[PDB]
């Protein structure tokens, strides 16, 4: 952690099924052919580690 927030650590938030790709996650029934947006999510989510947590 650091004063301005340490955001260098990622975790996977979305995946098709249970267990390092960045393929856009299709939440809906509409194919996500390269563009992220509604029901097309980037699969990774950053942590917000701060000295104040």
């Amino acid at each position, epitope marked *: 952690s650091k004063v*301005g927030g340490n955001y260098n650590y990622l975790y996977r938030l979305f995946r098709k099924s249970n267990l390092i790709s960045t393929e856009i996650y299709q939440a809906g029934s509409t194919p996500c052919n390269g*563009v992220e947006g509604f029901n097309c999510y980037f699969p990774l989510q950053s942590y917000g580690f701060q000295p104040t947590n």
Partner: antibody
Amino acid sequence: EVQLVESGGDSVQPGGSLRLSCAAAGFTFSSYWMNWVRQAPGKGLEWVANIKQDGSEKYYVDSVKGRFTISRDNAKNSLYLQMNSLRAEDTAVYYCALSSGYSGYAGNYWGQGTLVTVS
Amino acid sequence: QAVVTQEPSLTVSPGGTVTLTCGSSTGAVTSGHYPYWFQQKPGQAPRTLIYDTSNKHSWTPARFSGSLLGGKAALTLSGARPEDEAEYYCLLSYSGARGVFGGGTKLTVL
């Protein structure tokens, strides 16, 4: 990657007309909404116009009502914005934007922008 | 109608937080206005950071967040960096697809 490339901007005479165009690549065109934005130099972004995913509906900011027309050709993966009675006041960089959001009113992916100068 | 207000400018020391705000002239900001936030550096096309109130794009630094305050939208930075100097714009939807941009809030780093 996902890209939008707009052009057609030029130095034109006021009172005349100008047709701008945007070519899309890297994604399926017929899946999303297309948005237009203009930015006058020294000013922030304004909103100009939109169009429905299937082309059945168009939408505009009141300031361009009756003056701007939007249509697209999904066979060419491109859209057009044509404006009549183009004003000298309307000097701006026009941007092509792709809207993949929930309501489809605002773009997520933006082109580099084409400069429209009227004189 | 098309009146969206923002604080004209903010100045924040590196590592400090920044709160940018955005509100309409009528009612209050809700998820129904699907608010957007953009960041524009001089000489460049604007980059979208936040969409549909709080969703972040893959190119959006995790430092930014689309929280809501007392009936108005905000964009909060968890730790300002020199790379964040830009004009930020907010965009609100209304009764239809006629978005209105805010005047813009210039954010600089001390």
